[PDB]
Structure formats: C-alpha cells, structure tokens
Amino acid sequence: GRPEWIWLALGTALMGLGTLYFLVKGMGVSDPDAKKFYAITTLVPAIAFTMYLSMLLGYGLTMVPFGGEQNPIYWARYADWLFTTPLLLLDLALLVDADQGTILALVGADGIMIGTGLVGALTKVYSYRFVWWAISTAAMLYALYVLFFGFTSKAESMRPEVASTFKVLRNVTVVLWSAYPVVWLIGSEGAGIVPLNIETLLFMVLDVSAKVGFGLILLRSRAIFG
Ligand SMILES: *C/C=C(C)/C=C/C=C(C)/C=C/C1=C(C)CCCC1(C)C
Ligand SMILES: CCCCCCCCCCCCCCCC
Ligand SMILES: CCCCCCCCCCCC
Ligand SMILES: CCCCCCCCCCCC
Ligand SMILES: CCCCCCCCCC
Ligand SMILES: CCCCCCCCC
Ligand SMILES: CCCCCCCCC
Ligand SMILES: CCCCCCCCC
C-alpha cells in the first residue's frame, strides 16, 4: 500500500478512458489520413495505461542505492516514455509534412533522452545521476528546438487550419515536456525534495495532459483529414 497508488490508479483510469474514447472515434472514421492520426494517437494512452496499471499492481519499481539510502525508482515510466514520446513527435511531424531525415533525427534524440534518463535513474553514484540527467535534458532541448524552429517553419507551408492546430499542439508539448526534467531533478530520482507521492501526482498530470489532452486537441481538429 504505497501512498502514491492513488495517482497510479487515477492515471490508469484516465489513460484507459481516453484510449477507449480515441478507439471508438477512430474506428468510426473512414478518411485514410485521419485514420493514421487515430492509430498513432490511440496507441499512446494505450501504452501509458498498461504501464500505469503495471506500476499500480507493484511492477516497474526497483530500489537504487544512492546518498547512503535505498531509493524507490519507478523504471516502468521509461518503458512507457520510450514508445509514447516518439509516437507524439510523429503526430506533429505528420501534421507538418516534416522531412524523413528530420523525423529520424527527432526519434533518435528522443531515444537518447529516455535511454540516458533511465541510466540516470538507476545510477548508484549520486553525482553521476546528474550527469545523465543533463545529457537527457540536452537531447530533450534539441527536440524542442526542432519542434519549435523546424516544425513551425514547415507548418507555415500548410493551410492555416493545419498550422494553427500544429501550433497549439507544439505549445502544449513545449510547456509539458519542459517540466519533466525539473520534476526528476527535485523528486525521487534526483534531489529527493519532492516525495514520491507528490512526484507521482506531478507525472500523472503531465502524462495525461501530454497524451489525452494532446489527443483531444489533435483528434477533434479538421487538421487530420485528407
Ligand atoms: C507521455 C509521456 C511524456 C510526454 C513524457 C515526456 C518525458 C520527457 C520529456 C522526459 C524527460 C526527461 C529529461 C529531459 C531528463 C531527465 C529524466 C527524463 C526522462 C524525465
Ligand atoms: C542556427 C542556430 C543555432 C542555434 C542554436 C541553439 C541553441 C540552443 C538551445 C536551446 C534550446 C531550446 C529550445 C527551445 C524551445 C522553445
Ligand atoms: C486497446 C487498443 C488499441 C489500439 C490501437 C491501435 C492502433 C494500431 C492499429 C492500427 C493498425 C492498422
Ligand atoms: C541520428 C541520431 C540523432 C541525433 C542527431 C543530433 C543530435 C543530438 C543529440 C544529442 C545529445 C546530447
Ligand atoms: C566526472 C564528470 C563526468 C562528465 C562527463 C560528461 C560528458 C558527456 C558529454 C555528452
Ligand atoms: C551517448 C552519451 C554517452 C556519454 C557517456 C557519459 C559518461 C558518464 C560518466
Ligand atoms: C561540477 C558542477 C557541474 C557543472 C554543471 C553544468 C551542467 C550543464 C548541463
Ligand atoms: C515551494 C516548494 C518548497 C518545498 C521545500 C520545503 C521542503 C522542506 C524540506
């Protein structure tokens, strides 16, 4: 009965509900272009639901020694993030007709971000936890820079309704993702200032907003149609 369970349960509920909702709407769609946005966007909270439910049930948690103490670390988050973050980036890229080489660079930076975040979360030398954290943040900032500078440029060649939707979704992405590195720094993985229950609260609000909120904006737009 870990106190954070309540936010793991509410995350499960919300990701499950948004998945079913996106699935129902997406199955009703015949436009093949919108279909592609629904498939990507429905899979995102579906991965997040299975990870939240795993953690809810006691999996995806390990203990890592650092600072003279055994610290609980939820590693299943990175299993979620590894696939959902590039799926999110793809949605953006498809919206703006981004180049293939841009997408590959993006997904790559994304993989580094989550990969180094995870190595950081498991590292037993306290100071080195932060080296990995900084590397992961650096990769993240590359991706935000691409979304904000490169994808907006591409967005400007699209019809205004598409560019407008891109911009809301880009803004939501910049705000939410920029917060994760800060929560990790001050929370359980990092300085141990924010307790595990509050930090789980913070990730759940970030995750739901960034996946269901994101998908609610994309999937209700005219922007996704051929
Ligand atoms: C649905 C989940 C989302 C949108 C997750 C976003 C996660 C990140 C942007 C992760 C960022 C991290 C860093 C920038 C460095 C340290 C730890 C990581 C994984 C949390
Ligand atoms: C053409 C030139 C150059 C350069 C470079 C850039 C710098 C760096 C940093 C960082 C970050 C963030 C991003 C964005 C977002 C809204
Ligand atoms: C329960 C979950 C569902 C759904 C998701 C997914 C999207 C992938 C299927 C599209 C392949 C044609
Ligand atoms: C093709 C591999 C993707 C990476 C391309 C550029 C950049 C980045 C990043 C990383 C981090 C410190
Ligand atoms: C002892 C401090 C180690 C610093 C190494 C960081 C290099 C990674 C650059 C990407
Ligand atoms: C892909 C980045 C590799 C950098 C290794 C950092 C060394 C940590 C002490
Ligand atoms: C010895 C202090 C380390 C310096 C921190 C710089 C981190 C930049 C990402
Ligand atoms: C505004 C948040 C500050 C939290 C730090 C206070 C915790 C005391 C150890």
Transcribe 54-84 into DSSP letters.
HHHTT-SEEEEEETTEEEEEETHHHHHHHHH
Q: Which of 111, 108, 103, 114 is nearest to 180 (CA)?
A: 114
Whole-angstrom Cα distance, residue 16 to residue 56? 13
In the chain, where does DSSP find H-type helix? 5-27, 32-56, 76-96, 100-122, 126-145, 152-155, 160-186, 196-208, 214-219
Whole-angstrom Cα distance, residue 94 to residue 141? 21
Question: Could you say which ligand is closest to the alpha carbon of residue 137?
Answer: 1
Coil, strand, or helix at residue 121? helix
Whole-angstrom Cα distance, residue 136 to residue 115? 8
Residue 138: CB within 6 Å of ligand 5?
Answer: no
As given in the structure block, the two tokens for residue 24 are 């129902």
Whole-angstrom Cα distance, residue 109 to residue 94? 18
Residue 131: CB within 6 Å of ligand 6?
Answer: yes
As given in the structure block, the two tokens for residue 208 are 């739901």
81 CA to centre of own chain: 5
Angle at 211 between CA 140 and CA 83, to 5 degrees: 60
Q: In the PDB record, what is the listed experimental method? A: X-ray
Residues 6+ apart with CB under 8 A from 112: 135, 136, 139
Q: Per CATH, which fold does 1-226 belong to? A: Rhopdopsin 7-helix transmembrane proteins (1.20.1070)
109 close to 144: Cβ distance less than 8 angstroms: no
141 close to 112: Cβ distance less than 8 angstroms: no
Phi, psi of 62 (to 5 degrees): -135, 170
Q: Tell me the pairing of strands 69-74 and 61-66.
A: antiparallel
Residue 89: CB within 6 Å of ligand 1?
Answer: no
Question: Could you say which ligand is closest to the alpha carbon of residue 39?
Answer: 3
Q: Which of 99, 103, 104, 111 is nearest to 140 (CA)?
A: 111
Mutation pick for ligand 5 pocket among 113, 125, 128, 131 (CB with most ligand atoms within 8 Å): 131
**60 backbone φψ class: left, alpha, beta (φ>0; ψ -120 to 50):** left
- Residue type for position 2: R
Residue 131: CB within 6 Å of ligand 4?
Answer: no
**Atom 9 of ligand 6 has which residue's CA nearest to it?**
128
Residue 142: CB within 6 Å of ligand 4?
Answer: yes
Residues 6+ apart with CB under 8 A from 18: 45, 208, 211, 212, 215, 216
CA of 10 to the centre of ligand 8 (A): 25
Coil, strand, or helix at residue 98? coil
Whole-angstrom Cα distance, residue 176 to residue 179? 5
CA of 191 to the centre of ligand 5 (A): 19
Task: Give the position, in ligand 5's atom list, of the atom nearest the Cα of 135.
Answer: 10
Residues 6+ apart with CB under 8 A from 95: 155, 158, 162, 165, 166, 169, 218, 223, 224
As given in the structure block, the two tokens for residue 91 are 């949605």
In the chain, the N- to C-terminal Cα span, in Å, equals: 49
Angle at 195 between CA 194 and CA 197, to 5 degrees: 120
As given in the structure block, the two tokens for residue 58 are 């006691």
**Atom 1 of ligand 1 has which residue's CA nearest to it?**
207
Tokens 């939820």 belong to residue:
74
